Write a protein that binds this ligand. Structure first.
Ligand SMILES: Nc1ncnc2c1ncn2[C@@H]1O[C@H](COP(=O)(O)OP(=O)(O)O)[C@@H](O)[C@H]1O
Ligand SMILES: [Cl-]
Ligand SMILES: [Cl-]
Ligand SMILES: [Mg+2]
Ligand code: NA
Length: 378
């Protein structure tokens, strides 16, 4: 094609292409190596990726996200019913199948989860095409190891709808392992642990690889734990701070809260590299500017319990896999949240000082491996 590898994430998607023995993680029109898995509908346009997330604060009812949580599921599923209570957009029942309902150009419309995801995949396809200067058709699309046949089918369908010939649907943890060349034959079998902390989900997977063949020994995690939760802790902290300094509560002003949230998420990223971050919001509430800062130490404290809690699924995966810490040959960090120094410390300490595979940007590892596999299947 070349064929490309696409990581269709719950919160952010990435696309990579293997060329001249190297993988290239493609930046979008805004220079971003990751693209929000968001799609927005307005009185006049359909926005995707950065354009959609950048206006979520002002158009919450018609800005769709989390389509990956619905893809391949039935409307009556307990998780679907639970998730619906937290989404600002409407989810309706079409013959037992869930559909997101929105307003677009003054008319009510509904889309199957795979249709929303096809929109995100189309964006990823275009991003690759703009980079390559060639039409992109063949692709390998990844999915969480626990996805069933229906979820895998619906994901493949999203690709097909986007105009992609999905060469194969592979597991995200496996893709991450492939990125580090852990699929190469060295003789005996090897046990690898994938620690994936994304935007809204946490996945731990233990793979046993031998002769280039992968076996998923165990999976653990929390489908409702990720970077967003850390942002939440920061938001509450700053709402308290603003209330203290201005005797005003912004909690009910949706916009103000989303603006603070965006500022928090950004400050969070900075804290992975620096020990302090500045938050400066012009007229956050009733014309009041909010200029402040937060230290890495404070950020760690606000999230201490959540960070520490990531180790429980690690111990569980190990027990389910019938393996001791020492039997893990490689630990691979995946997901943007694993860039947090405290998380890396916790995991390494748990593994008694064992080195972590973190040379490939964690949030790019899945796409990286997917691109390699795509080239192999091409
Ligand atoms: N440098 C960083 N430090 C801390 N968190 C980060 C960093 N980069 C990205 N993140 C967080 O990673 C999350 C997105 O992770 P990602 O693995 O891309 O998600 P998914 O693949 O599950 O959609 C967001 O919560 C984002 O804030
Ligand atoms: Cl773009
Ligand atoms: Cl490597
Ligand atoms: Mg991911
Ligand atoms: Na994850």
């Amino acid at each position: 094609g070349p064929a490309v590898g696409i990581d269709l994430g719950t919160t952010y998607s990435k696309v990579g292409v293997f060329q001249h023995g190297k993988v290239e993680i493609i930046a979008n029109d805004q220079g971003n190596r990751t693209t929000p898995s968001y799609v927005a509908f307005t009185d006049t346009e359909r926005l995707i990726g950065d354009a959609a997330k950048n206006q979520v604060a002002m158009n919450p009812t018609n800005t769709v996200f989390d389509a990956k949580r619905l893809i391949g599921r039935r409307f009556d599923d307990a998780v679907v019913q639970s998730d619906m209570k937290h989404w600002p957009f409407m989810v309706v029942n079409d013959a037992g199948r869930p559909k997101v309902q929105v307003e677009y150009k003054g008319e009510t419309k509904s889309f199957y989860p795979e249709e929303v995801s096809s929109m995100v995949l189309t964006k990823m396809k275009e991003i690759a095409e703009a980079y390559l200067g060639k039409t992109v058709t063949n692709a390998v699309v990844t999915v969480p190891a626990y996805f069933n046949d229906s979820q895998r089918q619906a994901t493949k369908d999203a690709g097909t709808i986007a105009g992609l010939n999905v060469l194969r649907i592979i597991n995200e943890p496996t893709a991450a392992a492939i990125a580090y060349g852990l699929d190469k034959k060295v003789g005996a079998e090897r046990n690898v642990l994938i620690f994936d902390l994304g935007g809204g989900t946490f996945d731990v997977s233990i793979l046993t690889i031998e002769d280039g063949i992968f076996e998923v020994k165990s999976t653990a995690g929390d489908t409702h734990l990720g970077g967003e939760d850390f942002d939440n802790r920061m938001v509450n902290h700053f709402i308290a701070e603003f209330k203290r300094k201005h005797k005003k509560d912004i909690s009910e002003n949706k916009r103000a809260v989303r603006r603070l949230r965006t500022a928090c998420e950004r400050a969070k990223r900075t804290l992975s590299s620096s020990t302090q971050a500045s938050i400066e919001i012009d007229s956050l509430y009733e014309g009041i500017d909010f200029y402040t800062s937060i230290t890495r130490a404070r950020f760690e404290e606000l999230n201490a319990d959540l960070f520490r809690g990531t180790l429980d699924p690690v111990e569980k995966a190990l027990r389910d896999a019938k393996l001791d810490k020492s039997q893990i040959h490689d630990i691979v960090l995946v997901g943007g949240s694993t860039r947090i120094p405290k998380i890396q410390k916790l995991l390494q300490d748990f593994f008694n000082g064992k080195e972590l595979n973190k040379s490939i940007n964690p949030d790019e590892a899945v796409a990286y491996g997917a691109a390699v596999q795509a080239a192999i299947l091409s």
